[PDB]
Ligand binder design. Structure first.
Ligand SMILES: CC(=O)N[C@@H]1[C@@H](O[C@H](C)C(=O)O)[C@H](O[C@@H]2O[C@H](CO)[C@@H](O)[C@H](O)[C@H]2NC(C)=O)[C@@H](CO)O[C@H]1O
Ligand SMILES: [Cl-]
Ligand SMILES: [Cl-]
Ligand SMILES: [Cl-]
Ligand SMILES: [Cl-]
Ligand SMILES: [Cl-]
Ligand SMILES: [Cl-]
Ligand SMILES: [Cl-]
Ligand SMILES: [Cl-]
Ligand SMILES: [Cl-]
Ligand SMILES: [Cl-]
Ligand SMILES: [Cl-]
Ligand SMILES: [Cl-]
Ligand SMILES: [Cl-]
Ligand SMILES: [Cl-]
Length: 222
């Protein structure tokens, strides 16, 4: 179980490698992050981003629906978020928080899906290519997996996170974002503050319901 493979400096050089997309929000839009910004963002500073999200939390449907109140297309879908938690062993507070970041609090125009013929495809976790061209050409994960409803996008997103990240030993946000076992490969997002945004919402929800934190991992680099 020895997944500590690289020094921090080695990992930084890899994250700064040729063509690797690393972005930051500036003047209201996303721009490429510079080398210093990338390095700063990946620095370990001790802690929601380091918490194991493969452990479930005791949240009832009513509690999850409280989190989802006023969240657009996600409102009143707490039953299904909990279906996903139990089927796939995925922390439901994490799952909600991720969906809220990825969909603009459930209110973005993209969160309402992409039409293709008689069907509409939904994607609430930023998974794969998700625009009209990718849906038309058929080179969209959401279309491939037939996420033809919001509920199917909630379940399927969870299934994807479990099967592709959690089963790959990327068990916390930091690992999902920066894959320290194999730096610069298989990273969930280009936004250098992706983990911080999800972690902030998670912490608020933990403190709202009095939830206890699961295991926090400290060490990633030689
Ligand atoms: C969840 C997702 O789709 N995230 C995008 C991410 O893809 C990850 C790795 C995934 O499919 O789970 C994507 O990362 C690149 O993906 C291409 C394959 O499409 C790879 O060839 C690259 O090596 C990946 N790069 C890294 C650094 O992992 C990124 C690209 O910016 O976008 C994420 O939204
Ligand atoms: Cl480059
Ligand atoms: Cl990339
Ligand atoms: Cl309930
Ligand atoms: Cl929008
Ligand atoms: Cl995302
Ligand atoms: Cl895709
Ligand atoms: Cl992609
Ligand atoms: Cl639905
Ligand atoms: Cl990759
Ligand atoms: Cl990997
Ligand atoms: Cl981070
Ligand atoms: Cl506090
Ligand atoms: Cl608890
Ligand atoms: Cl470390």
């Amino acid at each position: 179980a020895n997944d500590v493979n690289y020094s921090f400096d080695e990992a930084v050089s890899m994250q700064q490698g040729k063509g690797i997309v690393q972005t930051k929000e500036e003047d209201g839009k996303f721009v490429e992050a510079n080398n210093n910004e990338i390095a700063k963002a990946m620095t370990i500073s001790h802690d929601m981003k380091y918490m194991d999200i493969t452990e479930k939390v005791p949240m009832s449907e009513s509690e999850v629906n409280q989190l989802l109140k006023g969240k657009g297309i996600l409102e009143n879908r707490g039953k299904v978020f909990l279906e996903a938690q139990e089927k796939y062993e995925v922390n439901v507070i994490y799952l909600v928080s991720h969906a809220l970041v990825a969909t603009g609090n459930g209110k973005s125009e993209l969160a309402k899906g992409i039409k293709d013929g008689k069907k509409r495809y939904y994607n609430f976790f930023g998974i794969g290519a998700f625009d009209s061209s990718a849906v038309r050409s058929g080179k969209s994960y959401a279309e491939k997996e037939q996420w033809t409803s919001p509920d199917k996008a909630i379940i399927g997103g969870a299934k994807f996170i479990r099967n592709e990240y959690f089963e790959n030993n990327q068990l916390n946000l930091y690992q999902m974002r920066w894959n320290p076992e194999n730096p610069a490969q298989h990273q969930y997002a280009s936004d250098i503050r992706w983990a911080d945004k999800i972690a902030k919402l998670m912490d608020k929800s933990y403190k709202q319901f009095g939830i206890k934190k699961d295991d926090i991992r400290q060490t990633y680099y030689k």
